[PDB]
């Protein structure tokens, strides 16, 4: 009768490669099928599953209740959207996926599943290479002579930003439905991203996308604290040869961490641990 809210944060950055990505997709579908069976047994509690693909940013995500007959299909659509190829897989943004997932743990789905165990599996093959900065800041959208005619993002979105609403200045799109923010000249400047507290807030992409700095790590750890701060136990699983115990030490609740995991062992690593 134990209720569960279980998230899966899945790295599809370009370091993964399509071979590992395809195995990961197959293994996760097996995990979800096993969990579906467990959730269908007599006396089973409510099991919500959240699945998010991430690279340069978190991409598509879905939340399902495993009692529903389209639950595995909705998870499958997210798996199918994952591109981990070397050339189009993307960068590695821990901070954004942590905040996206923290937002789910603030959601009505999670809060409504009372007395639940909140669990997250973080599945990655490498250190972060992007992060977010300037969160909640107020960028210039249109700079004119003087100040009185300047347009800031705050003049566009006000105090009531709605994620998915399109915002414009003189018919020019400034915030699109996916939350991409542009200046008046059409240059992309930032994104309206999950803040880890249930909201969507301006941020800019930072980092090189192909290397890791102390700042990248510090921002990743800060984002992680928003996720654990919701009362979530995180299990970090390091795939392959390029992620060490120490690279996952900050992102795992109990310090018991599997690294060097082969993609073909992923389902067992999750289900049998
Ligand atoms: Ca990577
Ligand atoms: Ca790799
Ligand atoms: Ca990707
Ligand atoms: Ca940050
Ligand atoms: Ca000005
Ligand atoms: Ca652990």
Numbering used by the authors: 4498 to 4770
Q: What does the primary publication say about this deposited structure?
A:
Here, using this criterion and an AlphaFold3 model of a 5047-residue RTX adhesin from Aeromonas hydrophila, we identified three different ligand-binding domains in this fibrillar protein. In both of these bacteria, the adhesins are single polypeptide chains of the repeats-in-toxin (RTX) family that are exported through the Type I secretion system but anchored to the bacterial surface by a retention domain that folds internally and is then too large to pass through the channel of the T1SS. The crystal structures of the two novel domains were solved to 1.4 and 1.95 Å resolution, respectively, and demonstrate excellent agreement with their modeled structures.
This 28.3-kDa domain was produced as a His-tagged recombinant protein and purified for crystallography. Subsequently, the structure resolution was improved to 1.4 Å with a data set collected at the APS synchrotron. The rainbow-colored ribbon presentation shows how the N and C termini (blue and red, respectively) lie adjacent to each other, which is a typical feature of ligand-binding domains because they bud out of their companion split domains. The vWFA domain has a classic Rossman fold of which the first half (in red and orange) is laid down before a 9-kDa insertion sequence (yellow and light green) emerges around the mid-point between residues 4628 and 4704 in the full-length adhesin. This insertion sequence folds into a short alpha-helix and an antiparallel beta-sheet with at least one Ca2+ ion present that coordinates OD1 and OD2 of Asp4647 and carbonyl of Arg4641. The polypeptide chain returns to complete the C-terminal portion (residues 4709–4773) of the Rossman fold colored green and blue. It is not known if the insert, colored peach in the space-filling presentation, modifies the binding specificity of the vWFA domain (colored gold) or if it is a ligand-binding domain on its own. Indeed, the apparent molecular weight of the vWFA domain during size-exclusion chromatography is consistent with it being a monomer in solution. There was no binding of the vWFA domain to the endothelial cells, to human erythrocytes, or to the two yeasts tested, but unlike the CBM3 and RTX domains, it did bind directly to the diatom E. spinifer, both in the absence and presence of biofilm-producing V. cholerae. When the crystal structures of the two putative ligand-binding domains (red and gold ribbon) are overlaid on their AlphaFold3 models (green ribbon) to compare their folds, the agreement between individual domains is extremely close, with RMSD values of below 0.5 Å.
